[PDB]
Amino acid sequence: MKRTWQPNRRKRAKTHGFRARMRTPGGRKVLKRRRQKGRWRLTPAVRK
C-alpha cells in the first residue's frame, strides 16, 4: 500500500533547507544547535 515516504526534492529543500531555517527564530536555533553539536550536515542533503 501507499507508504508515508514519498520523496520530492522541491518539497525537501523548501521545507527543511538552509533558507527555510534561516527565515525563522526556531530555525536559526536548529542551525545553532546542529553547529554546536558538530553535525557534518546542518540541513538535509538534496540534489537540486
Q: How far is the CB of 26 from RNA (least distance, A)?
A: 8
Give, as ranges, the residues between 6 and 35 that touch Mg ion (CB under 5 A).
7-11, 14, 17, 19-20, 30
> Considering CB distances under 5 to 8 angstroms, the limit depending on partner class, which of Mg ion, RNA, none binds residue 19?
Mg ion
CB atoms within 10 A of CB 1: 2
Nearer to RNA, 3 or 37 (CB): 3
Q: Which of 25, 37, 40, 48 binds Mg ion (CB under 5 A)?
A: 40
**DSSP calls for 35-48:** HHHT-S-SS-----
Dihedral sign of CA atoms 16, 30, 18, 48 in order:
negative
